[PDB]
């Protein structure tokens, strides 16, 4: 699709870039020492201040499919988001929050989604006091090398599942895929109730093996 | 009949620490750091503050690392985290150590020093971000299933000795239809099986990793309780 712009550089962006290999990514940062790592990761480097409108334009934010924002502090991240919104009101903005208390301000500035790595981290650590299964779960289903992965499968128009409940769909027994959620618009229902009825456009959030995932895609396709 | 839980030690201060402490309200926690500016933050969360160097064995001794329920390590760099872990292992070879890694390449070195579990917030973050380009459902899930205020939570439920499920396969156990809890994994020792096969057979000591409503969770606990009390 369209290129992705990343504003700022942290240790998050390095791991982000690694997963986005094969997509057109522009990294806008003012730290020149980072240029070589950016190129090594397969991305393009654009030197400038992401809180400056003219530099966001240089990165072609107005033609991006999304902008990911993670500057050194939350106030700078907010400043950058405000600059993006002056240029492009509709472009999807994903931002990293440093502090929990600032999340609402990141949204208010214009972020469509906020990710708080240190909230996630602190919560996983406190939950790892006796055993690490919850932390193992989160880190395994996000890793590519895992046999069992977390995927999103959209329910197409004319799907065999349209109008069918979670209970009657019997997705785990039929396909081997665990439904952990169904999402639509900006809403996510985790562990949907048996009487939730699938709609075309619903996104199924599932966990399964690659062959289980294919069985799921076939099961929910339109009749032939 | 409930033996008091042992204290937890936290070494260092990062932005993870504030949220960690918030979740450990109601348990005995000691925080060892050499930054005095954090003392008020520690007391405000209900924990105790110990001023000292976490890479210094005597200060680790002072922070009651010995006999702790767990030690959580999050220093400013991976080399310093490693230095701290080595100090802990000279004091207590068996205590459970959880460490925060700054850079991915250092994870195995942290494990080698003595960490039983490594958590990498920038790896998690980078991956969630990369998955959020079009929509945010995976990031919403991870952050939602970890929050206390959610109607649907991720929990760990142990299979008790003499359980009805002992010897019972996942298929025959029919846990989701019986209790309403999604089984996302089963754990034991340092190992986790995500989404166990139909013919996996439950054992006493197994930990069920599940997602459900509080009442569904209670139904799981009754279903798997011992036949004989
Ligand atoms: Ca399966
Ligand atoms: Ca349920």
UniProtKB/Swiss-Prot annotation, chain A:
The alphabetized UniProt keywords are: Calcium, Cell membrane, Ion channel, Ion transport, Membrane, Metal-binding, Potassium, Potassium transport, Transmembrane, Transmembrane helix, Transport
Lineage: superkingdom: Archaea
Cellular component (GO) terms are: plasma membrane
Subcellular location per UniProt equals: Cell membrane
What Gene Ontology molecular-function terms does this entry list? Answer: identical protein binding; metal ion binding; monoatomic cation transmembrane transporter activity
Give binding positions for Ca(2+).
70, 96, 98
State the Gene Ontology BP annotations: potassium ion transport
Is Amino-acid biosynthesis given among the entry's keywords?
Answer: no
Record bears the keyword Iron: no
Further facts: It is not known whether calcium is the physiological ligand. Inhibited by charybdotoxin (CTX), a protein from scorpion venom.
Question: Assembly state and interactors?
Answer: Homotetramer.
Q: What is known of its domains?
A: The channel is composed of 4 repeated units, each containing a transmembrane pore part and a gating ring part. The gating ring is composed of eight identical RCK (Regulators of K conductance) domains, in an alternating arrangement of one domain from each of the four subunits and four from the intracellular solution. Two protein interfaces between dimers of RCK domains from the pore-forming subunit and from the intracellular solution hold the ring together. One is called the fixed interface and the other the flexible interface. The flexible interface forms a cleft where calcium binds.
Q: What does this protein do?
A: Calcium-gated potassium channel.
Official protein name in the record:
Calcium-gated potassium channel MthK
Q: Which gene encodes it?
A: mthK
């Amino acid at each position: 699709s369209r290129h992705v712009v990343i504003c700022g550089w942290s240790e998050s962006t390095l791991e982000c870039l690694r997963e986005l290999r094969g997509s057109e990514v522009f990294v806008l940062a003012e730290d020149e020492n980072v240029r070589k790592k950016v190129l090594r990761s397969g991305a393009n480097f654009v030197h400038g201040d992401p809180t400056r409108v003219s530099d966001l334009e240089k990165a072609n934010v107005r033609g991006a499919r999304a902008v990911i924002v993670n500057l050194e502090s939350d106030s700078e991240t907010i400043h950058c988001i405000l600059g993006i919104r002056k240029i492009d009101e509709s472009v999807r903005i994903i931002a990293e929050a440093e502090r929990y208390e600032n999340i609402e301000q990141l949204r208010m500035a214009g972020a469509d989604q906020v990710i708080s790595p240190f909230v996630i981290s602190g919560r996983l650590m406190s939950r790892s006091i006796d055993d690490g299964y919850e932390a193992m779960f989160v880190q395994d289903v996000l890793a590519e090398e895992s046999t069992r992965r977390m995927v999103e499968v959209p329910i197409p128009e004319g799907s065999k599942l349209e109008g069918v409940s979670v209970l009657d769909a019997d997705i785990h027994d039929v396909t081997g895929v665990i439904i952990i959620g169904v999402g639509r618009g900006d809403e996510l229902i985790i562990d949907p109730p048996r009487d939730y009825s699938f709609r075309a456009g619903d996104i199924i959030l599932g966990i399964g093996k690659p062959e289980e995932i294919e069985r799921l895609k076939n099961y929910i396709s339109a009749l032939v």
